[PDB]
Structures are given as C-alpha cells and as structure tokens.
Amino acid sequence: MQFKVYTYKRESRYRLFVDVQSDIIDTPGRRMVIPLASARLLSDKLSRELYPVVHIGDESWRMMTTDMASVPVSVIGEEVADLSHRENDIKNAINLMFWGI
Amino acid sequence: MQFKVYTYKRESRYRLFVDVQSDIIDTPGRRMVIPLASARLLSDKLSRELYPVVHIGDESWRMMTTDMASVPVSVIGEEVADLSHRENDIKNAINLMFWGI
Ligand SMILES: [Cl-]
Ligand SMILES: [Cl-]
Ligand SMILES: [Cl-]
Ligand SMILES: [Cl-]
C-alpha cells in the first residue's frame, strides 16, 4: 500500500522499504518500493531533498530514492510504519530524481 | 544520459534499458533505468499509457516502467539508441506509476 513501510523477508542491502506505487496501479505479484537506510553511519552531506529523513522505531532513516526498485509480494514482510504524513517530501524526492525539479 | 538506450554487459531479464535519471542528478557509479522488452511475445492488453511502445533496431519494444531499477556504470554497455523524442510518453508512464495521474 502506497507509503506503508515493510521489512524484507529475504536478506537485502537494507532492512526496510517504503511502497511508493500508486494504489490504483496494479502489477500482479509486485510493488515498486524505495529502501530505507539507517541514518546513523551515513554522510551528513547526503541531500535531504533527494534523500529525505524519516523516523521509525525511535531512530532516523534516509529514504534511498536512487535505490528504487520493484519487489515480489513474496518478499513483503510485516508492515512496521506508515509514512503517508511525509508524502510531500517523498513526492518531491522522486520527482527530483527524474525531472531535476 | 537521460533517454539514451544501452545494452547490458551482464545477462539480465531484458537486453536493453533506457536511462531515465535527470542529467543534473549525480549518483556516482550508478544510474536509474527502465528495461525494454521485445513487444513480439507480450500481451496485446498491456497498457500503452503505463508501458509505452518504442522502436529500436527495426522492431517494437515495451518500456517496462514497473521494472525500473538502478544499475552500476560497470554494467552499462554500448549505446544503441536515443528515445528523447518519446519524452512525453516516457514522463507520462513514470508519473502514472507513482501518482495515478
Ligand atoms: Cl541500514
Ligand atoms: Cl517521519
Ligand atoms: Cl525481451
Ligand atoms: Cl520510438
């Protein structure tokens, strides 16, 4: 579901992802997602506009916009958070990546 | 380079991709891309709005918008075509996938 955050069932580079696909775009068996990285050991120079900072589990995470990819529903684990309150920053980051605006 | 089409140097599910990242968004060592699939053996019901039809090498291809992903520059092979003349349909497909508009 768009803007919900899930854990991966299989080992991946990151441990959470946010679903960014529209809820009226049907791709059977898959969803387009963006991984979230723990902010703790990342560069302080990472653009906040392209890589928004969000809060889950009492810590900070960066949305790894440029590591967007689709996953099969078989890898979609437990839902751990909802980022719909950060739609503006998420939309801005995605649009920046393609359109530089 | 945005809207240029390249072959993969390593075996992938598809054999061409289009670079869709902005040319002023720098991700060192990587680019965001969308694979192209040969249209020949695909369903005739596949949405043209979400999966545009383009022409390369004297055949038709579908832009596999929902299989968008980043690749390392090490996998970027020869440039085989430029799809900048299809920017309107490419932009429409990408925006549809996230925003349903
Ligand atoms: Cl991490
Ligand atoms: Cl947040
Ligand atoms: Cl193919
Ligand atoms: Cl074309």
Author numbering:
A (entry chain A), B (entry chain A): 1 to 101
Question: What do the paper's sentences say?
Answer:
The primary experimental system utilised is a 101-residue homo-dimeric protein, CcdB (Controller of Cell Death protein B), which is a part of the toxin-antitoxin (CcdB-CcdA) module involved in the maintenance of F-plasmid in Escherichia coli. The structures of the S12G, V46L and S60E mutants of CcdB were solved to resolutions of 1.63 Å, 1.35 Å and 1.93 Å respectively.
The structures of S12G, V46L and S60E consist of a single chain in the asymmetric unit, with two chloride ions. In the present study, we selected three such suppressor substitutions, Y8D, V46L and S60E with ΔTm˃3°C. The suppressors Y8D, V46L and the suppressor S60E were ~3 kcal/mol and ~4 kcal/mol respectively more stable than the WT. The WT could refold back till 2 M GdnCl, whereas the suppressors Y8D, V46L and suppressor S60E could refold even at 3 and 4 M GdnCl respectively. The hydrogen-bond interactions are formed between the main chain oxygen atom of L46 and side chain nitrogen atoms of R62 (NH1, NH2). The average B-factors of the V46L structure are lower than the WT with the most reductions in the loops 8–14 and 39–46. V46L also similarly affects the rigidity of the 8–14 and 39–46 loops important for CcdA binding and GyrA14 rejuvenation. The CcdB positions 10, 12 and 46 are involved in CcdA binding and mutations at these positions as well as the nearby E11 residue will affect CcdA interaction and conformation of the CcdA interacting loop from residues 8 to 15 (8YKRESRYR15).
